[PDB]
Design a protein around this ligand. Structure first.
Ligand SMILES: [Zn+2]
Ligand SMILES: [Zn+2]
Ligand SMILES: [Zn+2]
Length: 233
């Protein structure tokens, strides 16, 4: 089906296609779908205008989807993606890095993410981002801040803030409001996750939009909700 302006869901995105959703001036999410344990899930990433170029946050979960992402960006926006950052080592964040690299996109991740991706047999971003190794650490990268809040969904997970727009992209460390479960916790630190979310809340108290790794964006309450969901689990 067609979203007709609504935030798109799995019912509007067949596996292999990508949609964009404008969040603010020069900020979009990208939404794709793919399969885990035989079920199809939506997944979000971010696109941020960087002058006459675009910065991509996270792949669209695989090679076919990521090629579709590049085509959708060219259709909708018409500016080149020149850099990408992956926010943790799982396939919904690095799967498609080989497609990006061949298309001339410089791919980046923390050294922790790169080592974990390598060990998992996943695709590996080309460049290492120093300065993100301890909880609370951050760096500026083009038009965004990259922040390591501590272990949560994974030990390496990063969040991304767009200061110009007060948009916080939480990746998989943040759940959508309808979420009832902590999701895939195989690599999570459930005991630390609420503390890590608290660090995000303290560091980005002026966030107006919070985008989860999967599902619908909302306001600041996605952070508290996530802590609640994880504590419950
Ligand atoms: Zn793949
Ligand atoms: Zn993950
Ligand atoms: Zn995820």
């Amino acid at each position: 089906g067609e979203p007709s302006g609504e935030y798109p869901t799995v019912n509007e995105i067949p596996v292999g296609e990508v949609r964009l959703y404008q969040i603010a001036d020069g900020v979009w999410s990208h939404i794709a779908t793919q399969s885990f344990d035989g079920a199809v899930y939506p997944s979000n990433g971010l696109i941020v205008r960087d002058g006459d170029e675009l910065l991509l946050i996270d792949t669209a979960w695989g090679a076919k989807n990521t090629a579709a992402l590049l085509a959708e960006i060219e259709k909708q926006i018409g500016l080149p993606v020149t850099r990408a950052v992956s926010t943790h080592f799982h396939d919904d964040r690095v799967g498609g890095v080989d497609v990006l690299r061949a298309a001339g996109v410089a791919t980046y991740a923390s050294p922790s993410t790169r080592r974990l991706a390598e060990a998992e047999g996943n695709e590996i971003p080309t460049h290492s981002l120093e300065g993100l190794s301890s909880s609370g650490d951050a760096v500026r990268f083009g038009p965004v801040e990259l922040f390591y809040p501590g272990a949560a969904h994974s030990t390496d997970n990063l969040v991304v803030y767009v200061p110009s727009a007060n948009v916080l992209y939480g990746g998989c460390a943040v759940h959508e409001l309808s979420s009832t479960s902590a999701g895939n916790v195989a690599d999570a630190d459930l005991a630390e996750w609420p503390t890590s979310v608290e660090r995000i809340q303290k560091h980005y108290p002026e966030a107006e939009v919070v985008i989860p790794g999967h599902g619908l964006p909302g306001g600041l309450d996605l952070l508290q909700h996530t802590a609640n969901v994880v504590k419950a689990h």
